[PDB]
């Protein structure tokens, strides 16, 4: 399962951001198909619930090579829900920058295991249980607000 995680990180800037991929160290555009050659770490999409999206090929068959080969990409295409898959996705590109294609309210943010990694300036955020109705169906997930 975890073999579908893109691992192409490169700490050229000597910042040490790959540490957050392992442990919670003190940190202190339309959705299209992206190549796994640039992605570093898990790719999360928010439906609004947080979901990980693994590496696939150009057709959609699952690949388990950690995003090594140039053929491995990420299937990031969805309409706006309920009919669509997700509203957007976030991930870290291989040199340590956060990319987007989680913000419910300008004050809150959908919490997920790597929320502090993608958004470092969200540490001093209390947690709130949020019920959200997207087309009649409810979603009980945790959000990180002020």
């Amino acid at each position, epitope marked *: 399962h975890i073999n579908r995680t893109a691992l192409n990180c*490169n*700490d050229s800037l*000597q910042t040490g951001f790959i540490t957050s991929l392992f442990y919670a160290k003190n940190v202190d555009r339309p959705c299209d198909v992206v190549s796994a050659r640039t992605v570093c770490g898990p790719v999360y999409c928010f439906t609004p619930s947080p979901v990980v999206v693994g590496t696939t090929d150009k057709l959609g068959i699952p690949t388990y090579n*950690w995003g090594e080969n140039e053929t491995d990409v990420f299937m990031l295409e969805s309409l706006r829900p309920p009919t669509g898959g997700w509203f957007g996705c976030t991930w870290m590109n291989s040199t340590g920058f956060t990319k987007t294609c989680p913000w419910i309210t300008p004050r809150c943010l959908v919490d997920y295991p790597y929320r502090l990694w993608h958004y470092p300036c969200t540490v001093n955020f209390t947690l709130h249980k949020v019920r959200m109705f997207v087309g009649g169906i409810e979603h009980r997930f945790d959000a990180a607000c002020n």
Partner: antibody
Amino acid sequence: LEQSGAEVKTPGSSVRVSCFNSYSINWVRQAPGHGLEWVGTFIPMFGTSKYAQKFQGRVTITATAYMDLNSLRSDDTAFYYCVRPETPRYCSGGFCYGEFDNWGQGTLVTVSS
Amino acid sequence: LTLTQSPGTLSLSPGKRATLSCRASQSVSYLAWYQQKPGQAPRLLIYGASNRATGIPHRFSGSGSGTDFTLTISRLEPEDFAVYYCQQYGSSPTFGQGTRVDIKR
């Protein structure tokens, strides 16, 4: 770091040596009167393990840390330091490679008949 | 792949400058320098050929690229007489031989 004490064994037997942030478990050996040889490297977060060529089919690194060396030889007589580095420099599927930072106190292994 | 350290033994009195060389048989910048006092475990000194590890004195400095790398100590101290190793961690981890530094006499 904390490691096991020195143990004397016979050829062909098996040894299990024991071994704060850490992303990998690196084992490095030093033959008395020689340089430094790199034994395998294990990553618990991903479950992968990359071993050396001469130690290909007879070493395993389980998960405290452990190192299993099967089918011993007279050449394996050396100190065995385990390294648990802190920050990784680059990942390239499915491992993350970096320098050796926190070294162990040392575990001497002697293999004689 | 094989690293070649020169010179083998380096005779230097306290206060003098030390310069080591780590010749690489192929292109690499991913190189590390370690010192090992007799009886102790190795201690990381420099990572990435240039960057200096945390808590390492300013005297330990390194440079180089490609095949030729150089470790330089500003002024030798009595606690700096040990064996020194260079290690490549960019592909398969390989170490160099000893580069012993002793008290001159």
